[PDB]
Symmetry: C2
Subunit: 97 residues, 2 copies
């Protein structure tokens, strides 16, 4: 404890459990504040990106999605997190500057 | 001409039509070479990323997805392209280094 909540499925991350908990709990609070509406998920992606820049340094990208996904950023190591909360998959990783 | 093919839906891009055509035609050839299988879309994302680094400079990220999506990278301008071919949405944008 603090422990990863039971309604998050961690898919892949190079971040520690304390960071996983802050990131996922923040995402859940944002989605809840926006009543889970897809129509407002852009605000959520933006507020997640700003939260992460502030807290863990720039530059973050945030992708929220439904369905499946396949990605490539870099074979070299970089700060990253991928998880599922309900219907929404959340991707976030940090790039230079 | 070269013109954007009728089976691509451009969703948003800051790249010119010549670049749009090369990127989308390359994506279509890769998906066709992999028989459209979701199970191999990781190879496609990787080969798209390498094609784009080579052709337009580093560093590219590539996300292929089904379903909906909402993202944020940067309010500042950066090289980007988003489009749909059949069931697959393809996102790609360039970050520093
Ligand atoms: Cl993020
Ligand atoms: Cl990868
Ligand atoms: Cl790409
Ligand atoms: Cl945005
Ligand atoms: Hg995110
Ligand atoms: Hg792509």
């Amino acid at each position: 404890a603090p422990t990863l909540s039971t309604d998050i499925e961690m898919i892949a991350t190079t971040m520690s459990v304390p960071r996983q908990v802050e990131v996922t709990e923040k995402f859940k609070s944002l989605v809840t504040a926006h009543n889970g509406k897809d129509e407002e998920m852009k605000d959520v992606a933006q507020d997640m990106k700003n939260y992460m820049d502030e807290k863990y340094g720039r530059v973050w990208q945030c992708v929220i999605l439904t369905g499946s996904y396949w990605m490539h950023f870099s074979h070299e190591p970089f700060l990253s997190i991928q998880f599922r909360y309900g219907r929404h998959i959340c991707l976030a990783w940090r790039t230079p500057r």
